[PDB]
């Protein structure tokens, strides 16, 4: 079906009407999204079928039609843009300076923006427009606000 590069909505008809469960990135013929969005299930693109190719619950990532292609990284200094694709609303770029998630295994960038849960999978971009990660797996802080990790996979 549709294999053009870009940001896509991930929809279902199992619930009431058509519901947006998440978002993904098509790049180099590979569809990239977060594991919690699809739970590794197959996807439909018009009349075509996309089968899962790689996935990992711990990283909360899954790729379709091929291996993970997104290899850009946050430089740890510069501002970035969340290309938010919220449910029933137009794609919108939001500029922000990432914070940090300090873990025993190393530090990861974090974006402090609040969108509905169906926004999971929206890409995070650097100044050249390269995807440095996906938005949607993170934590809730004391004021009920949501902070997401900048979740990036590994390219072979």
């Amino acid at each position: 079906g549709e294999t053009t590069d870009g940001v896509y909505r991930v929809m279902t008809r199992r619930l009431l009407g058509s519901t947006q469960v998440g978002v993904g990135v098509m790049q180099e013929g590979v569809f990239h999204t977060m594991w919690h969005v699809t739970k590794g299930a197959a996807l439909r693109s018009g009349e075509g079928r996309l089968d899962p190719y790689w996935g990992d619950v711990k990283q909360d990532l899954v790729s379709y039609c091929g291996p993970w292609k997104l290899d850009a990284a946050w430089d740890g200094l510069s501002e970035v843009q969340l290309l938010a694709v919220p449910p029933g609303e137009r794609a919108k770029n939001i500029q922000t300076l990432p914070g940090i998630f300090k873990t025993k295994d190393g530090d990861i960038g974090a974006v402090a923006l609040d969108y509905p849960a169906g926004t999971s999978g929206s890409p995070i971009l650097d100044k050249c427009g390269r995807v440095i990660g996906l938005y949607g797996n993170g934590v809730v802080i004391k004021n009920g606000s949501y902070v997401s990790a900048i979740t990036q996979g590994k390219r072979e």
Binding site: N93, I94, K102
Partner: protein
């Protein structure tokens, strides 16, 4: 059941809405991929 629909191109947009803070949080990542606050 699940299906994809195109939503846009992946580009950086000059003069976009600038919002959001930069918090430093101590976190733990479990086997199920869940992040949690360590304070």
């Amino acid at each position: 059941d699940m299906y994809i629909e195109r939503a846009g191109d992946i580009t950086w947009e000059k003069d976009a809405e600038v919002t959001g803070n930069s918090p430093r949080l101590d976190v733990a990542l479990d086997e199920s991929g869940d992040f949690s606050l360590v304070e």
